[PDB]
Design an enzyme around this catalytic site. Structure first.
Site, PDB file in Angstrom:
ATOM      1  N   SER A 149      45.771  46.847  81.211  1.00 53.04           N
ATOM      2  CA  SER A 149      44.575  46.565  80.473  1.00 53.04           C
ATOM      3  C   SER A 149      44.091  47.255  79.378  1.00 53.04           C
ATOM      4  O   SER A 149      42.961  46.826  78.560  1.00 53.04           O
ATOM      5  CB  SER A 149      43.529  46.678  81.429  1.00 53.04           C
ATOM      6  OG  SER A 149      43.747  45.934  82.624  1.00 53.04           O
TER       7      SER A 149
HETATM    8  C1  LIG Z   1      44.547  46.577  83.877  1.00 54.54           C
HETATM    9  O1  LIG Z   1      45.079  47.624  83.787  1.00 54.54           O
HETATM   10  C2  LIG Z   1      44.636  45.786  85.151  1.00 54.54           C
HETATM   11  C3  LIG Z   1      43.096  45.788  85.867  1.00 54.54           C
HETATM   12  N1  LIG Z   1      42.123  46.541  85.044  1.00 54.54           N
HETATM   13  C4  LIG Z   1      41.990  47.571  85.871  1.00 54.54           C
HETATM   14  C5  LIG Z   1      41.365  48.958  85.383  1.00 54.54           C
HETATM   15  O2  LIG Z   1      41.390  48.957  84.144  1.00 54.54           O
HETATM   16  O3  LIG Z   1      40.719  49.775  86.094  1.00 54.54           O
HETATM   17  C6  LIG Z   1      42.609  47.548  87.013  1.00 54.54           C
HETATM   18  S1  LIG Z   1      42.832  48.721  88.269  1.00 54.54           S
HETATM   19  C7  LIG Z   1      41.591  49.005  89.098  1.00 54.54           C
HETATM   20  C8  LIG Z   1      41.109  50.824  89.244  1.00 54.54           C
HETATM   21  N2  LIG Z   1      41.760  50.791  90.386  1.00 54.54           N
HETATM   22  C9  LIG Z   1      41.610  50.113  91.481  1.00 54.54           C
HETATM   23  C10 LIG Z   1      42.663  50.069  92.519  1.00 54.54           C
HETATM   24  O4  LIG Z   1      42.545  49.245  93.350  1.00 54.54           O
HETATM   25  N3  LIG Z   1      43.586  50.922  92.477  1.00 54.54           N
HETATM   26  C11 LIG Z   1      43.361  52.336  92.929  1.00 54.54           C
HETATM   27  C12 LIG Z   1      45.029  50.866  92.296  1.00 54.54           C
HETATM   28  C13 LIG Z   1      41.844  48.658  90.498  1.00 54.54           C
HETATM   29  C14 LIG Z   1      43.016  45.920  87.298  1.00 54.54           C
HETATM   30  C15 LIG Z   1      44.191  45.900  88.169  1.00 54.54           C
HETATM   31  C16 LIG Z   1      45.203  44.319  85.018  1.00 54.54           C
HETATM   32  C17 LIG Z   1      46.545  44.262  84.040  1.00 54.54           C
HETATM   33  O5  LIG Z   1      45.362  43.583  86.245  1.00 54.54           O
END
Ligand SMILES: *C(=O)[C@@H]([C@@H]1NC(C(=O)O)=C(S[C@@H]2CN[C@H](C(=O)N(C)C)C2)[C@@H]1C)[C@@H](C)O
Ligand SMILES: [Co+2]
Ligand SMILES: [Co+2]
Length: 448
Positions: free
Chosen positions: A159
């Site tokens: 992202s």
């Molecule tokens: C981008 O990297 C992905 C999406 N955007 C983000 C983000 O920037 O945080 C996430 S991850 C989000 C933060 N932590 C959460 C979790 O479930 N974990 C601890 C693994 C979710 C999205 C995945 C885009 C590429 O999908």
């Protein structure tokens, strides 16, 4: 009969020495390469071979400059020139230490970080964990990092790539930070299904909230307004898929599939940062363009060279590249403040509040990207690159910081999760404090 050239030295931007030669005796006379900082910036500097010529790093790639040419009698010996890097040893030392203990704390396989000067794109720090020590034999250091992953080893950005989409919808007049959108939990796009990292019905996210909360659906809806051609064009203007020309050996170009080859699902992947790869330097270089009011200056690590007489020639400055207008760049910086905004009620909190530094307009973006499983030629479910890139500060851009962690089990500071946001916090806050930089209303990510 032979008149030996004296090897030149490698120094930082303030002429603080990284590598220099002293005369000793053993085949009687013997020059000794000194590395007073040990492993400091050794990913960049390199090391010498037994004969006193470069073995790897800049010692090797700039060997001709540093070694000069032996004389004889008459042909006068041409002593080596001294190379001045853009590095600031104080910043490099702090960043390199923080990178090592983010690796230890997070359980990541490797960690790297890049700090660029916001206006010039000069490389102020470039570091990886586990850096070797060129004052010791390299044959004893197979368990060490001998190279420079920040330029040689591309990854998928996740992202953090969404800065391209944000910049394109604002630059082409297709949306504004305050536009209230309607973002469903998933959409079908180009034959595939994209889902947001959390289950949700239609959310009234603002455009600011789409990037602040990192909504994939919201990102792709806005990217549909841009179109594939204008989007691919912006990818190229940000410098992706192309070497920067930074002046370091082993630089990778990354990989951006050219638009004529996209499958039906490429456009559903690139805007959220999957399906393309970049180096940490290219990634940080994208945020430098936005930091510099829309004008990307390709990063450089050679500042100048000093001839043996003592006369100094500055390295030529790379040509500017206009990516977006200044107005657009200022809008994107302000929007990316939402990523680091705290909200106890959750509603107006970004994904990286620990990256914020109170009293400063920090702006940045979090990333998580699946890696490719080497055995199935398909994505791992639970193996990620973690990324963060940010600007200190939005209202006064001085520093640009890019960070990648290779599959951590914990945050960069050791707390549960897997975010690089705390590493950005540490570095960015320290850059403000050490320069005694002096300290509006909350941003709306989610409407009613
Ligand atoms: C981008 O990297 C992905 C999406 N955007 C983000 C983000 O920037 O945080 C996430 S991850 C989000 C933060 N932590 C959460 C979790 O479930 N974990 C601890 C693994 C979710 C999205 C995945 C885009 C590429 O999908
Ligand atoms: Co002659
Ligand atoms: Co703090």
């Amino acid at each position: 009969d032979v008149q030996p050239a004296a090897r030149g030295s490698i120094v930082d931007r303030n002429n603080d020495r990284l590598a220099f030669t002293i005369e000793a005796r053993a085949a009687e006379r013997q020059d000794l390469r000194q590395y007073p900082g040990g492993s400091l910036a050794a990913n960049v500097v390199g090391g010498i071979d037994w004969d006193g010529h470069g073995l790897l790093g800049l010692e090797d790639s700039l060997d001709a400059v540093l070694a000069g040419t032996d004389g004889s009698v008459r042909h006068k010996a041409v002593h080596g020139s001294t190379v001045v890097l853009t590095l600031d040893n104080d910043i490099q030392f702090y960043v390199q230490q923080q990178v090592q203990q983010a690796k230890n704390l997070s359980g990541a396989h490797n960690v790297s970080a890049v700090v660029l000067d916001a206006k010039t794109g000069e490389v102020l720090a470039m570091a990886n964990d586990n850096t070797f020590d060129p004052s010791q034999d390299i044959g004893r250091q197979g368990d060490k990092q001998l190279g420079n992953p920040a330029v040689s080893s591309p990854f998928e950005p996740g992202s953090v790539n969404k800065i391209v989409a944000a910049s394109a919808v604002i630059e082409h007049g297709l949306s504004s930070p305050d536009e209230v959108l309607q973002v469903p939990g998933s959409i079908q796009m180009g034959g595939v299904t994209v889902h947001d990292a959390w289950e949700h019905g239609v959310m009234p996210y603002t455009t600011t909230g789409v990037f602040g909360k990192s909504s994939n659906v919201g990102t792709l809806m806005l990217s549909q307004r841009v179109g594939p051609e204008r989007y691919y064009d912006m990818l190229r203007k940000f410098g992706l898929g192309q070497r920067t020309g930074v002046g370091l050996p082993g630089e990778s170009a990354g990989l951006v599939p050219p638009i004529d080859q996209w499958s039906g699902s490429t456009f559903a992947n690139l805007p959220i940062g999957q399906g393309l790869s970049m180096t940490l330097l290219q990634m940080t270089g994208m945020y430098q363009a936005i930091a510099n009011d829309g004008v990307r200056v390709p990063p450089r690590i050679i500042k100048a060279t000093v001839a043996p007489d003592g006369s100094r020639t500055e390295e030529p400055r790379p040509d500017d590249i206009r990516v977006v207008s200044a107005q657009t760049a200022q809008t994107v910086r302000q929007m990316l403040r939402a990523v680091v905004q705290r909200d106890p009620m959750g509603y107006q909190q970004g994904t990286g509040p620990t990256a914020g530094v109170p009293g400063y307009q920090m702006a940045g973006k979090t990333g998580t990207a699946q890696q490719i499983n080497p055995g199935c030629g398909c994505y791992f479910d639970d193996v990620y690159w973690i990324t963060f890139a940010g600007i200190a500060t939005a209202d006064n851009p001085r520093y640009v910081i890019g960070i990648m962690l290779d599959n951590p089990a914990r945050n960069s500071d050791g707390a549960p999760g897997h975010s690089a946001a705390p590493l950005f916090h540490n570095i960015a806050g320290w850059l403000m404090q050490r320069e005694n930089v002096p300290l509006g209303p909350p941003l709306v990510l989610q409407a009613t």
